[PDB]
Amino acid sequence: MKKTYRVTLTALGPIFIGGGEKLMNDLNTFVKDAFGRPYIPGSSLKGALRTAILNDLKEDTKENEVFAHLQVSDSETIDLENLKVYQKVDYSKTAKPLPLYRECLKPNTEITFTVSFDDEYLTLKKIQNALHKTYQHYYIKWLKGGKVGETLIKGVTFALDQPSQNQGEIIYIGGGAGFVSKTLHYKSKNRDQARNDSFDILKQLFRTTYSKMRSVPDNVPTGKHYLEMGKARIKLEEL
RNA sequence: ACGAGAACAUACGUUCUUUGAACCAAGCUUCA
Numbered sequence: 001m002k003k004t005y006r007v008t009l010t011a012l013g014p015i016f017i018g019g020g021e022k023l024m025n026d027l028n029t030f031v032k033d034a035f036g037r038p039y040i041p042g043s044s045l046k047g048a049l050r051t052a053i054l055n056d057l058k059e060d061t062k063e064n065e066v067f068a069h070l071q072v073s074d075s076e077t078i079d080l081e082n083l084k085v086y087q088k089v090d091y092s093k094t095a096k097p098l099p100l101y102r103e104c105l106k107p108n109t110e111i112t113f114t115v116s117f118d119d120e121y122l123t124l125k126k127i128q129n130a131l132h133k134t135y136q137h138y139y140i141k142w143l144k145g146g147k148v149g150e151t152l153i154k155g156v157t158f159a160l161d162q163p164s165q166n167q168g169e170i171i172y173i174g175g176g177a178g179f180v181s182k183t184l185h186y187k188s189k190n191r192d193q194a195r196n197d198s199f200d201i202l203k204q205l206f207r208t209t210y211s212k213m214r215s216v217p218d219n220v221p222t223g224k225h226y227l228e229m230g231k232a233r234i235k236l237e238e239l
Numbered sequence: 240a241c242g243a244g245a246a247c248a249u250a251c252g253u254u255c256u257u258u259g260a261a262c263c264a265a266g267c268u269u270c271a
Binding site: 043047061067 | 270
């Protein structure tokens with residue numbers, strides 16, 4: 001069928017998709033086009049749908065048969081007045097601005113995408129249930145322990161957004177929203193899998209153990225919002 | 240004081256006239 005969609009992202013948090021050209025001043029730069037006008041490349045959305053569908057064992061290989069057909073294009077190109085400076089804060093305990101800043105996209109930015117995919121193995125029947133599955137396990141596998149354990153009253157304007165819509169089609173794109181948003185294997189147990197990836201992570205660095213690892217929300221610059229970043233809403237309409 | 244003397248097997252004559260090394264064939268597949 002080649003069912004094309006016009007999906008649109010609205011930003012619940014500050015977002016910074018890599019860039020490569022990146023340097024208390026710490027002046028940063030972002031991915032732009034050749035006209036100096038920012039946009040979001042389609043590989044970010046393809047990685048987000050890789051988190052969505054391929055949440056399984058390590059078969060994410062050149063032998064793959066699903067994601068050669070998922071034809072994600074780029075977006076429309078938005079001017080640079082949709083951009084404010086923001087800060088990095090780690091909400092584990094005693095939340096303080098860490099010295100690692102970024103010039104990033106302003107929240108609630110309307111960006112739209114010409115996303116299409118073939119129907120040989122790919123439908124929205126898969127996308128809907130896979131996104132609800134990944135969202136529900138993003139709470140019940142990692143963030144439920146962050147809700148019940150080592151929780152401070154500063155974070156609870158914050159939207160828990162679980163009674164809102166169970167078919168909300170929510171993804172996570174990689175924008176420095178912790179090293180939990182760049183995962184692939186959460187199936188299907190709670191704490192044995194947690195300690196599994198805990199030694200898998202802690203043989204790559206030197207931290208003393210504590211639960212839970214690293215949750216990175218953000219806020220607004222007195223009005224406060226405690227806006228978690230990395231997540232966005234998607235609509236699915238044809239053409 | 241030889242069946243012997245003398246006597247170029249020589250002259251003129253394009254290995255030449257025809258015709259495409261063509262047709263068939265995303266540097267692409269998985270990469271936040």
